[PDB]
Amino acid sequence: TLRELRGRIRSAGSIKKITKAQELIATSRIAKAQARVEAARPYAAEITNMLTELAGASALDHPLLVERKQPKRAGVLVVSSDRGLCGAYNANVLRRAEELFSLLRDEGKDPVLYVVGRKALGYFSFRQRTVVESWTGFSERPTYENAREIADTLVNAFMAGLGVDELHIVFTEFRSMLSQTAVARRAAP
Amino acid sequence: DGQCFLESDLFNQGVRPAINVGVSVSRVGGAAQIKAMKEVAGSLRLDLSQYRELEAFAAFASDLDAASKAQLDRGARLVELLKQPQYSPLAVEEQVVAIFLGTQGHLDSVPVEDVQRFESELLEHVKASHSDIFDGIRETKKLSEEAEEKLVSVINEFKKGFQASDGSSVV
Amino acid sequence: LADADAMHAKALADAKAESEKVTEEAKQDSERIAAQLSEQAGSEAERIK
Amino acid sequence: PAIVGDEHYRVAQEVIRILQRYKDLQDIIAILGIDELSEEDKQLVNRARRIERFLSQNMMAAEQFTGQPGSTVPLKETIEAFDKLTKGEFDHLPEQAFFLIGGLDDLAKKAESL
Amino acid sequence: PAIVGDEHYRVAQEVIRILQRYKDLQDIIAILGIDELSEEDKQLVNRARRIERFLSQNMMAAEQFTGQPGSTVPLKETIEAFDKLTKGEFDHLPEQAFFLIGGLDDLAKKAESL
Amino acid sequence: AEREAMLAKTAADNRKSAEQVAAAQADYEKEMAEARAQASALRDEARAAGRSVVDEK
Amino acid sequence: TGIKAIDAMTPIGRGQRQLIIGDRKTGKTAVCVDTILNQREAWLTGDPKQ
Amino acid sequence: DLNVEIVAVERELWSGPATFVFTRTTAGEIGILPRHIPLVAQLVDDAMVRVEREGEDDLRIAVDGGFLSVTEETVRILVENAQFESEIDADAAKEDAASDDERTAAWGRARLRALGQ
């Protein structure tokens, strides 16, 4: 009916403006995020250099460098969004996380979940696997105070052995504005 | 008994003739199409329709699996293979070879910026020597086993003889 | 080092020999294409006449 | 259900509920694509797209266009297949596995070809 | 390229490409400013700004107001001028050097006097 | 100085052996690519000469 | 027809009807003129069946 | 001769030349001059830095959980958070030093120490 179609052209003509605005806001924020990545990079390089020098002098008997006697459990940290509209970003993270689970349970470790973001906390609220701890309010603007708490909680869960024999992180690696993928890294041991 | 729906979006992008597959079809055709053409083109309609959907999807994805990416790059080279200039009707003995190049994957070493020139030089080379391929197709309607091996022995000699406008020689 | 330099001398001799084969094949290729376009020129002049 | 029996009618309402819900999401799907849906809807649309493609068949009359032969699927193997689909048994198989295929044995074969 | 020469068709398709990129980038230019663009995109916008200026002409209708005579640019000079301009051969000239100008010899005359 | 120079020359000659093997491959493929490109330029020159006789006729 | 796309994907048999539907200035005439031009390779042979 | 950097987990926060820089570490208070051995040390929980160079008068700093790395040619100091004496507030630092949370009390003392008290 023409009245319906006129309304739908009015609707779609509003949405085209609101999505074109958020394409341009996301085009601002990728530049700010790349600035904060390249500002956090020189510290990460110098802490790696300092840690290489200390490991050169050390006996290396620090717990985070050694395998547990029985592979009882594994931690997975999954990093994901609070905002929607991100597209396949969370689909890719959550698919790579479920693939990591298949490999871990193939070795015999059951995963235990730590989650950053509200979308993955929704996904693991629908699929009946528990989350041990979560964080939500900062995925678009993470601050070191947040990563301090996450890394403390992960290291406490590794050193507790109610504890994990290894732990991993699943997140998307930014490699260009046109190319990113979900990746899985073992952070400990 | 069918339609060749010419899409103005494809025509403005420069795909000419602008045959919009899936919505274009022939419902009598396939009975009358000569056996060699029917052997080479027997999947090409389906391979182009699945390319149009796969591209309309993947143009807004960061990355995809290697089998899908191979199907996409094949499809984009088949689209560059099918276009041709006005008032240049090809004889069927030249059409079936031009579609053999693309469907059998011999274009997979050639970049999308050179593919139309690659077919244009190859179809003159095979018109100048090895012409028993074109003559055989014309006089028996069939791309026989002994014409197929004699074609693949010539396409590889031409691929080493060819150089893209950017990148290396082909293989 | 004598094996490596012997392989360099061998590879340069092989490359010049097959380069001579490619350029000889191209002398045929340039006549072969020029003949087909000369036949096209005669056919087009016949069409006009 | 009085005429086709309960197991047919249950399946033929579960299939229609699913495709109806997918068609009532199509206005969002057209703009944003799949991932912006909620997980209870995204679960549904993933099976809806499989059910939608699995209602295709290689017909006896299609042989004059596709060259492939035609298939016949008995009513019992039809009900069973859509019962398993609507209960979610096949959600790990890709959408391309379901196109133009006759029955469960031929679905299994096509999935193993991929 | 049948009715006009291949060179004319190529130059016009390239001018359209450069102006199509710039008409896409004008949203970023207005919302985020020129500094948001890469070195390759600012190298394009520098050419695109100059191309859209070089499409302007001092013409025999404007003789009424400016007193300066209107200019005719031959087709061959127009093609050759936009071929050199799209290949960037005037990037070191400011935009004001391209406004209201009667071909390539006249561009040199405005640009050296500016 | 001789015993030090013997191991110095042995390690240098081995490093140059690996470099000379790489240079054998790189010269072989560089000559091959230059010759094949020259064949394409010769055919292309003959195709343009063919076009020139077509329009001349 | 002597068009690669059409003789590959939508082959025109003799006594078929084949609709060259499209928009304005889309080459509909150029597909038909290419089809009519192509037949000269058969018209030179005097037999009424080619 | 020496060059100095102060670096934070998220920023290259400050850098200049150096000819005297001083730090207090779980081993004690230590100065570093234009030639010094390679050193690694951890700064105290309530820790402050003073940075001095041949080009100009020195600079005064508060640091949280810092680490120090030296070689005679280059010096780098690596920090969880840092605040300059021109940006530390005396009422906020005094309030933080009165707090019951151990890191906040240490950071309060760190900012009080950069404020010369």
Could you write out the DSSP letters of every residue in F1-54?
-HHHHHHHHHHHHHHHHHHHHHHHHHHHHHHHHHHHHHHHHHHHHHHHHHHHHH
**B38-161: CATH topology:** Lysin (1.20.150)
Hey, are the CB atoms on F39 and C14 less than 8 Å from each other? no
Written as one letter, the residue type at F50 is: G
State whether the Cα torsion F7-F11-F17-F20 is positive or negative. Answer: negative
Per DSSP, the three-state class of B130 is coil
Residues spanned by the domain of D40 = 1-114
The b/e string for B140-161 (b: 16+ C-beta within 10 A; e otherwise) is: eeebeeebeeebeebbeebbeb
- Element containing residue B102 per DSSP (H, E): helix B92-103
State whether the Cα torsion A139-A144-A146-A149 is positive or negative. Answer: positive
| Calculated CA dihedral for residues D23, D25, D31, D33, nearest 10 degrees | -100
Phi, psi of B22 (to 5 degrees): 80, -60
Asked whether G16 and B26 are in contact (CB, 8 A), the reply is yes
Q: What is the distance of C-alpha B142 from the center of its chain?
A: 18
Q: Taking each helix axis from N to C terminus, what angle separates D39-54 and D6-23, rounded to the nearest 10 degrees? A: 120
Neighbours of B10 (CB within 10 A): 20
**CB < 8 Å & 24+ apart, contacts of H13-18:** H13/H79, H13/H82, H14/H59, H14/H61, H16/H51, H16/H53, H16/H55, H16/H59, H17/H53, H17/H54, H17/H55, H18/H51, H18/H52, H18/H53, H18/H75
Tracing tokens 């949203």 back to the chain, one arrives at: E27
What is the rounded distance in angstroms from the CA atom of residue H68 to the CA atom of residue H79?
9
Q: Is any Cβ of chain B less than 8 angstroms from the Cβ of F37?
A: yes
Q: Is any Cβ of chain A less than 8 angstroms from the Cβ of E36?
A: yes
**Annotated catalytic sites of B, by residue?**
27
Asked whether A168 and A186 are in contact (CB, 8 A), the reply is yes
Query: Taking Cα atoms as reference points, which of E64, E78, E111, E79 lies closest to residue E92?
Result: E111
Per DSSP, the three-state class of A170 is strand
- Size of chain G in residues: 50
Query: Taking Cα atoms as reference points, which of E81, E79, E95, E13 lies closest to residue E46?
Result: E95
Contacting residues for H110 by C-beta, under 8 A, at least 6 apart: H45, H46, H47, H48, H62, H63, H64
What is the rounded distance in angstroms from the CA atom of residue H46 to the CA atom of residue H66?
10
Phi, psi of E17 (to 5 degrees): -55, -50
What is the rounded distance in angstroms from the CA atom of residue F43 to the CA atom of residue C23?
10
What is the rounded distance in angstroms from the CA atom of residue H52 to the CA atom of residue H4?
10
What is the rounded distance in angstroms from the CA atom of residue F29 to the CA atom of residue C12?
10
What is the rounded distance in angstroms from the CA atom of residue B97 to the CA atom of residue B103?
10
Asked whether A150 and A138 are in contact (CB, 8 A), the reply is no
Hey, are the CB atoms on B26 and G11 less than 8 Å from each other? yes
Hey, are the CB atoms on A88 and D35 less than 8 Å from each other? yes
C-alpha distances out from residue H5 to A32, A35, B15, H76, Å: 23, 19, 59, 5
Q: D with A: 3 or more CB pairs under 8 Å?
A: yes
Query: Taking Cα atoms as reference points, which of B82, B92, B107 lies closest to residue B158?
Result: B107
Chains that touch E (3 or more CB pairs under 8 A): A
Distance from the H78 Cα atom to the nearest Cα atom in chain A, whole angstroms:
7
Supply B129's token pair: 């020597």
What is the rounded distance in angstroms from the CA atom of residue B79 to the CA atom of residue B64?
20
Query: Taking Cα atoms as reference points, which of A167, A78, A171, A89 lies closest to residue A131?
Result: A78
Chains that touch A (3 or more CB pairs under 8 A): B, D, E, H
Report yes or no on H99 lying in a domain: yes
Query: Taking Cα atoms as reference points, which of A172, A61, A158 lies closest to residue A120?
Result: A172
Asked whether D104 and D81 are in contact (CB, 8 A), the reply is yes
Asked whether H47 and H33 are in contact (CB, 8 A), the reply is no
Asked whether H6 and H61 are in contact (CB, 8 A), the reply is yes
Query: What is the count of structural domains for chain D?
Result: 1
| Calculated CA dihedral for residues B101, B106, B109, B112, nearest 10 degrees | 20
- Element containing residue B68 per DSSP (H, E): helix B66-82
Asked whether B49 and B21 are in contact (CB, 8 A), the reply is yes
Q: Is any Cβ of chain B less than 8 angstroms from the Cβ of F38?
A: no
Tracing tokens 């059910």 back to the chain, one arrives at: D51
Per DSSP, the three-state class of B62 is coil
Distance from the C49 Cα atom to the nearest Cα atom in chain F, whole angstroms:
11
Q: What one-character DSSP code corresponds to residue G22?
A: B
Hey, are the CB atoms on A24 and E28 less than 8 Å from each other? yes
Suggest the residue from F38, F43, F45, F54 to mutate for an interface test with chain B (most B CBs closer than 10 A): F43
The b/e string for F31-55 (b: 16+ C-beta within 10 A; e otherwise) is: bbeebbeebbebbeebbeebeebbe
C-alpha distances out from residue B30 to D69, G13, G39, H115, Å: 16, 8, 20, 90
Q: What one-character DSSP code corresponds to residue B163?
A: B
Asked whether E104 and E80 are in contact (CB, 8 A), the reply is yes
Report yes or no on H117 lying in a domain: no
Q: Is the preceding omega at residue D74 within 30 degrees of 0, hence cis?
A: no
Written as one letter, the residue type at A110 is: D
Q: Taking each helix axis from N to C terminus, what angle separates A118-126 and D39-54, rounded to the nearest 10 degrees? A: 60
| Residues 105-164, chain B, touching A (beta carbon < 8 A) | none
Residues spanned by the domain of H54 = 2-108
Q: How was this structure determined?
A: cryo-EM
State whether the Cα torsion A54-A55-A61-A67 is positive or negative. Answer: positive
Contacting residues for E27 by C-beta, under 8 A, at least 6 apart: A20, A24
Phi, psi of B25 (to 5 degrees): -160, 160
C-alpha distances out from residue B109 to B74, B164, B169, B171, Å: 10, 10, 9, 7
* HSE value, Cβ hemisphere, 13 Å, CA-based, for E81: 20
Neighbours of B118 (CB within 10 A): 23
Supply A30's token pair: 């990728």
Phi, psi of A183 (to 5 degrees): -135, 150
Q: Which residue of C has its CA nearest to F18?
A: C4
* Chain H residues in contact with chain A using a Cβ-Cβ cutoff of 8 Å: 7-12, 40, 67, 69, 76, 78, 80-81
Supply A4's token pair: 């319906």
Supply A63's token pair: 């717990």
Tracing tokens 């995809």 back to the chain, one arrives at: B64
Supply E14's token pair: 């390239």
Report yes or no on H116 lying in a domain: no
Beta strands (DSSP E) in A88-151 are: 110-116, 131-135
Q: Which runs of consecutive H residues, i.e. helices, occur in chain E?
A: 6-32, 39-54, 63-66, 75-86, 104-113
Phi, psi of H98 (to 5 degrees): -80, -10
C-alpha distances out from residue H38 to A55, D51, D109, H63, H74, Å: 15, 69, 67, 21, 9
C-alpha distances out from residue A142 to A33, A34, A131, B105, Å: 10, 13, 20, 48
Asked whether E59 and E24 are in contact (CB, 8 A), the reply is no
Asked whether H6 and H23 are in contact (CB, 8 A), the reply is no
C-alpha distances out from residue E57 to A140, D90, E70, E73, Å: 50, 67, 8, 9
**Dihedral class, residue B2 (left if φ above 0, else alpha if ψ from -120 to 50, else beta):** left
Question: Å resolution of this model?
Answer: 3.4
Contacting residues for B130 by C-beta, under 8 A, at least 6 apart: B150, B151, B154
Chains that touch F (3 or more CB pairs under 8 A): B, C
Contacting residues for E84 by C-beta, under 8 A, at least 6 apart: E90, E104
Q: Is any Cβ of chain C less than 8 angstroms from the Cβ of B135?
A: no
Neighbours of A39 (CB within 10 A): 16
Distance from the B124 Cα atom to the nearest Cα atom in chain C, whole angstroms:
7
Strand H39-42 with H67-71, pairing: antiparallel
What is the rounded distance in angstroms from the CA atom of residue A173 to the CA atom of residue A179?
9
What is the rounded distance in angstroms from the CA atom of residue B118 to the CA atom of residue B167?
14
Neighbours of D53 (CB within 10 A): 16
What is the rounded distance in angstroms from the CA atom of residue A52 to the CA atom of residue H60?
30
State whether the Cα torsion B17-B20-B22-B28 is positive or negative. Answer: negative
Q: Please calculate the CA angle D53-B23-D73 and round it to the nearest 5 degrees.
A: 30
Written as one letter, the residue type at A109 is: K
Query: Taking Cα atoms as reference points, which of D60, D56, D48, D42 lies closest to residue D100?
Result: D56
Q: Please calculate the CA angle A125-A130-A136 and round it to the nearest 5 degrees.
A: 60
Phi, psi of E41 (to 5 degrees): -75, -40
Query: What is the count of structural domains for chain H?
Result: 1
- Residue A116: beta bridge partners? A79, A135
